[PDB]
Every structure is written in structure tokens, then in C-alpha cells.
């Protein structure tokens, strides 16, 4: 079990940790989150009571250091920081815990939810998509644009998601124009899986990070990347049977965890009707299809 202390809470803010969150009042004595499970990635995120635009957060992994939160009044946001001094860090954690001013990562032991949403997410892969190598944790907010969005402005703040484009020379072998555009198996299996991602697990990892960023920050380009990646699989006639069964599980838990009131902007009607009903994989997402029908029949 790990702990992320907070120096203070100077402003009223809704603090999230993974899929959990809490309201914290201006200069309430709040001093961090304890009992955080080691072994997965996590995301601590923030929405100020005054500016409901701009949700922002940090992805991290406790195995990679001792991290804490401090409000910066110049920049006006809660910042993640690293303490390199172990003793000084265990010292601050033990005292706040003794004074009991920390909330507990409220995990039900029956619940695999966070594990299913992050199964393939690996902090190393995240830091390649959010390049800022002076930190071990990665910052993301509502307004950050993706690299593909920047092509169609500042690159330091870009989401470097892998670029997928169905109408590109990459995706379309000369002479197999019609074949490759109707059956994207080539692009998925050779170009992306074997070429760029190297294996399904990195692919799935970026797919789940893309989802969590759209969900926790309403990052519209993240939403676009998640859908692009689902579509590429479902528009492929030849997919490893293990990816299909894992994909069905992945989507199931994402559709399950989504806030019911946000399904309108976060779910692309065309892509889902294609994966579930039109595509090659119409028959292969039994869990995802069942959950979509009983929860969002309208969008279909």
C-alpha cells in the first residue's frame, strides 16, 4: 500500500483518484490519499469548484518514486511533485496518517474494475505519449490536443498517440486499394501490431489510456483515438481470437464505468453501430453488445 500526501488544500476542489472522488472545501485540512494499491498505474485528478472547465490530473505509479501534491498559487493548480528524500517523505506520511487527515483509497475487495480498465496500461508507454521526461508522472487536461489533431500547435503539450488514418498510404497497399480499405486486417496485423505496437498488449494499453483520458478529462482527441483503435480492429476480418475476447472484456468494463449522462459526446454512434452490427466482428463482442443494448439502446 502506497500514499500520496498533499501539502494543503488552499482552494475548493473535487479530487479524483482512479474512478473515486471526493469534495474538498477551501482550506479544509486535507492531506492526501492512503492505501493506494501498488501494482497498477493510477490517475489523481482535479476539478476546481470555481472553473468546471479544465479537469486535469497526473498519471503515476508508486513503484517509480514517492509523489505528493502541492497547490501552486502562481499557476493556480495542484501540482504533482517527487520527493527524492525517502526519510523526509516517510516522515511526512507517517505524521499525517497519525493525525488521520488522509482519506483511504476506498477499494471493495470484490471489485476488479480498476484492474480491468488499466490491465494493459504501462507507465513507460504513457511517458512516450506525454513527453516530459524530467518527471516520473504524466500531466493531462481537458484541453490538450493530439499530434494528429495538430497536423489538421505547441508540440510540448501534445498527446503523441499513435496516428491511425484509414485513407493513407500506410493503411493501403498499392494494388490492394479496395481489399485493404474494406478489410483492414493488413493495417492492423502487419503495420500496427507487428510494425509499430510490436504486440497486442501495447496496442490495448494505448487504447485503454485513450479511453481513460476521454473519460476523466473529456479530452476530445483522446475520445477520437479510442474510437479509431476500436474501429481498426472491428473493421479487420482476421483478428487473433485472443484479442477479440480480450477486446470484448476491455470495452465491457469501459462502457460499464462510463457516467450515464455523458454517453452522447463520448460514444461515436457510427463506430459502435459498425463494430456491433455491420463489421466483421459483429458476432464477437457478446458482452460489449449486451451491455450497450441494455444501457444505451437509444444511441443504437
Amino acid at each position: 500500500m502506497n500514499t500520496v500526501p498533499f501539502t494543503s488544500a488552499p482552494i475548493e476542489v473535487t479530487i479524483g483518484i482512479d474512478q473515486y472522488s471526493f469534495n474538498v472545501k477551501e482550506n479544509q485540512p486535507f492531506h492526501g490519499i492512503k492505501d493506494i494499491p501498488i501494482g497498477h498505474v493510477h490517475v489523481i485528478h482535479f476539478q476546481h469548484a470555481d472553473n468546471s472547465s479544465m479537469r486535469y490530473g497526473y498519471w503515476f505509479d508508486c513503484r517509480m518514486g514517492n509523489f505528493y501534491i502541492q497547490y501552486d498559487p502562481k499557476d493556480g493548480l495542484y501540482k504533482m511533485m517527487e520527493e527524492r528524500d525517502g526519510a523526509k517523505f516517510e516522515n511526512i506520511v507517517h505524521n499525517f496518517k497519525e493525525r488521520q487527515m488522509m482519506v483511504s483509497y476506498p477499494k471493495i475487495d470484490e471489485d476488479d474494475t480498476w484492474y480491468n480498465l488499466t490491465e494493459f496500461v504501462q507507465m513507460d508507454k504513457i511517458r512516450k505519449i506525454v513527453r516530459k521526461d524530467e518527471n516520473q508522472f504524466s500531466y493531462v487536461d481537458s484541453s490538450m490536443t493530439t499530434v494528429q489533431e495538430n497536423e489538421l500547435s505547441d508540440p510540448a503539450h501534445s498527446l503523441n498517440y499513435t496516428v491511425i488514418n484509414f485513407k493513407s498510404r500506410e493503411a493501403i497497399r498499392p494494388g490492394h486499394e479496395m481489399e485493404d480499405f474494406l478489410d483492414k486486417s493488413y493495417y492492423l496485423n502487419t503495420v500496427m501490431l507487428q510494425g509499430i505496437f510490436k504486440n497486442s498488449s501495447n496496442y490495448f494499453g494505448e487504447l485503454q489510456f485513450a479511453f481513460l483520458n476521454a473519460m476523466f478529462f473529456g479530452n476530445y482527441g483522446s475520445s477520437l483515438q479510442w474510437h479509431a483503435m476500436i474501429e481498426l480492429i472491428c473493421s479487420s476480418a482476421t483478428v487473433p481470437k485472443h484479442m477479440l475476447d480480450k477486446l470484448d472484456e476491455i470495452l465491457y468494463y469501459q462502457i460499464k464505468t462510463l457516467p450515464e449522462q455523458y454517453s452522447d459526446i463520448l460514444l461515436n454512434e457510427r463506430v459502435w453501430n459498425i463494430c456491433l452490427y455491420s463489421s466483421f466482428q459483429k458476432n464477437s463482442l457478446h458482452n460489449t453488445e449486451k451491455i450497450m443494448e441494455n444501457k444505451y439502446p437509444e444511441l443504437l
Partner: protein, 237 residues
């Protein structure tokens, strides 16, 4: 963006552009089998690719052989259309390649676009206009060269004959489309109108009679009148 009545005169500036109509690429007859089931028999088809400004037509004949042993033919026809248009663009010198290709049916955008990936600076555009270029097979010499073909073949025409010697592109294209519109709505009447007078002949190198200026005026009025007549019949107006 899309071509419509607003951005209509763009057709006639000095940016090379082609219209691609694919309605005649896959043409069948429908008939009963000995056992009573329905079956289709294909006949020779064609891509209609036309420079509205210059009148240059690239009539790419589609031989029935291209269908042999293929499924989802109506789908395939769109891909073959794009394959041929692309090859036509690749065959042209750079300064003759078009800056835009306007497809008469939206279903052609994806195949064309995919086939033109090598020409990122050629814009592929849909259109909202209701152009009558399906009636192109009502032009006798075009239907003749397609039906006779024994192999894939490209045949070049100027669909405007020599009209440009005397009238503007805008006007030529208006005449062209008025005449095919008429041929589309009532081919027998339209054809009667064009050929009634045996003394007005079609030059061997032309598609349409050698009407004088005054005679084109009468023709176009007869074509107009025809088109209105058929509308009233269509909707009981």
C-alpha cells in the same frame, strides 16, 4: 466542398477539373432462368469523365469480361471506376492533370480518394447538383462504341462538337445538360426532336447535328418544352 448552384461558375474558370459519372459502369439486363429464378446478364458499360470547360471526354469502356468471377459487382464497379480514373490521371502529363475531380455520386468519394492517395493535391469533391450524365448512352455514337467493344478501350470525344468555336463553355455546358436532361426524361421524344429534319446531319467526327445558330435556338426551346411537359405528367400538375 460540394458543388451546387452557388459555386456553379467555378466549372468554367481555368482550373482543370473533371466530372466522373459512374452510373453506366455496371449495366445488366434482368431475365428469368429456366427454373424461374431471376438472373442478371451484364453488358458493356462505361465511365463518363468530362472536362466541362473544354468538352474533352474520356469514355473508358468497361468490357463485361472485367466482371467475370467477381462478387458484389455494384460495389466492385465503384472501385474499378476509381481504378480507371486514377490510371487516366497518371497517364496525363502533369500540367494536364486536374486540380479537382467532381463525382456525380457520393458513393464514389471513398474509392476515388483511396485510389488518388498518390495525388494529395487533387481535390475529390461531391456535388449536390442533379446532373443528367446517366443519359450519355442515349447518344447514339457513344452507345454504339460501347456496345461493339470486344476489349477494354478508351475512346476520346469532344462532347461539345465545335460549339466552342462560337459559344462560351458556360453555354455549351448548359446546352449539353439541357439536351441530356431531355434525353433522360423522354428519350423517344428527345431523339425525335434532334433528327426530325433529314437535311441536318451529324458530321462523322461529331455527336450532334450541325445545327445553325437559329436552329439551336429552336431545338433548345423544343427541349425545354419537352422537359416541362413530362414534369406535369409525372406529378399531375
Amino acid at each position: 466542398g460540394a458543388m451546387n448552384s452557388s459555386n456553379y461558375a467555378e466549372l468554367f474558370n481555368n482550373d482543370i477539373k473533371l466530372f466522373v459519372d459512374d452510373t453506366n459502369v455496371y449495366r445488366v439486363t434482368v431475365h428469368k432462368t429456366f427454373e424461374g429464378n431471376v438472373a442478371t446478364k451484364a453488358i458493356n458499360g462505361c465511365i463518363f469523365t468530362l472536362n466541362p470547360k473544354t468538352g474533352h471526354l474520356f469514355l473508358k469502356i468497361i468490357h463485361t469480361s472485367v466482371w467475370a468471377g467477381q462478387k458484389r459487382l455494384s460495389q466492385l464497379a465503384k472501385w474499378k471506376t476509381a481504378e480507371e480514373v486514377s490510371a487516366l490521371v497518371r497517364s496525363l502529363p502533369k500540367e494536364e492533370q486536374p486540380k479537382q475531380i467532381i463525382v456525380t455520386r457520393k458513393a464514389m468519394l471513398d474509392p476515388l480518394e483511396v485510389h488518388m492517395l498518390d495525388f494529395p493535391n487533387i481535390a475529390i469533391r461531391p456535388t449536390e447538383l442533379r446532373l443528367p450524365f446517366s443519359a450519355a448512352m442515349s447518344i447514339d455514337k457513344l452507345s454504339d462504341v460501347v456496345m461493339k467493344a470486344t476489349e477494354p478501350q478508351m475512346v476520346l470525344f469532344n462532347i461539345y462538337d465545335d460549339w466552342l468555336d462560337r459559344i462560351s463553355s458556360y453555354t455549351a455546358f448548359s446546352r449539353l445538360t439541357l439536351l441530356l436532361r431531355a434525353l433522360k426524361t423522354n428519350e423517344e421524344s428527345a431523339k425525335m426532336i434532334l433528327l426530325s429534319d433529314p437535311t441536318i446531319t451529324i458530321k462523322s467526327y461529331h455527336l450532334w447535328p450541325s445545327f445553325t445558330d437559329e436552329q439551336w435556338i429552336t431545338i433548345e426551346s423544343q427541349m425545354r418544352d419537352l422537359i416541362l411537359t413530362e414534369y406535369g405528367r409525372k406529378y399531375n400538375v
